[PDB]
Design a protein around this ligand. Sequence first.
Ligand code: CJ9
Length: 154
Amino acid sequence: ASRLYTLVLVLQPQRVLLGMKKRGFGAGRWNGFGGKVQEGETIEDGARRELQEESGLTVDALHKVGQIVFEFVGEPELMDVHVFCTDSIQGTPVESDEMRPCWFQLDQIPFKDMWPDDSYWFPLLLQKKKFHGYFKFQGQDTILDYTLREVDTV
Ligand SMILES: Nc1nc(NC2CC2)cc(N2CCCCC2)n1
């Protein structure tokens, strides 16, 4: 059994939009925008909601780019993250209670201050290849196992 999560990456030709998480799960790490999927909304609905809540931004189209399943040692529920990207956004990203947004050149992505799995799967995101990932964490910082694959359908 897994819990659904969203992750939205605004990936333009020369830069990626990330947010510094100010509170809650993942505070202190840069990441794309997302969170738990609620009862009563589609996964993509929840993705749009978390983008708007955390950055003020809305988008015309979201594209499925990946799925990553996480196991945490001693935690019974797996976490199922659905990753989306978009290239065009509506509005200017602005700070919220959860996230401080900044653009990053693609050669200056802050991997040391991101989730450790990002350094593994971000290359596939940037080559615009669809992927399935699996990571076993011990705590929040230690990857014990992982698998990573490109897929034809996310
Ligand atoms: N890039 C990223 N890496 C993750 N690794 C898991 C914690 C060890 C989770 C995650 N998200 C889950 C919470 C919402 C935002 C997306 N996003």
